[PDB]
């Protein structure tokens, strides 16, 4: 018939809109996940650097007594 064509076009329109929304959401979710992983990476590197600095402060403190005895 004819109204079948109109209904079919309306449903194809809805499918187009839904698939577009899904694609956009998936892309943004991917991007946010990459940002989060970069943040975690820099946090762990920050812990490494802070640990090294604390180690060298401790060694310097160990050298303090040798200083005061000298």
């Amino acid at each position: 018939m004819d109204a079948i064509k109109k209904k079919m076009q309306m449903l194809k329109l809805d499918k187009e809109n839904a698939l577009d929304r899904a694609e956009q959401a998936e892309a943004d979710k991917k991007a946010a996940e990459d940002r989060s992983k970069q943040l975690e990476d820099e946090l762990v590197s920050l812990q490494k650097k802070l640990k090294g600095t604390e180690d060298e402060l401790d060694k310097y403190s160990e050298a303090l007594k040798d200083a005061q005895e000298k």
Binding site: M1, D2, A3, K6, K7, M10, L13
Partner: protein
């Protein structure tokens, strides 16, 4: 120099809703209504009328047979 369009205010891509969503439902419903009314008006009435004309045709056939037979009976000489 190329023409310079005076600056206005708005809008665009906001009439797509008001020209699309309207016919997205009204047109479908109206065409469904048209198909329903046309089928109802057309098909059943046509079949009933054809049956009526067929009955009249059969009666005409009977009348033709009777007249043909009586005339052949008389005229046979």
């Amino acid at each position: 120099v190329p023409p310079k369009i005076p600056d206005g205010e708005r809008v665009d891509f906001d009439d797509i809703h008001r020209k699309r969503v309207e016919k997205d439902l009204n047109e479908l419903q109206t065409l469904i209504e048209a198909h329903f009314e046309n089928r109802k008006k057309e098909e059943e009435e046509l079949i009933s009328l054809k049956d009526r004309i067929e009955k009249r045709r059969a009666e005409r056939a009977e009348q033709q047979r009777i007249r043909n037979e009586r005339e052949k009976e008389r005229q046979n000489r």
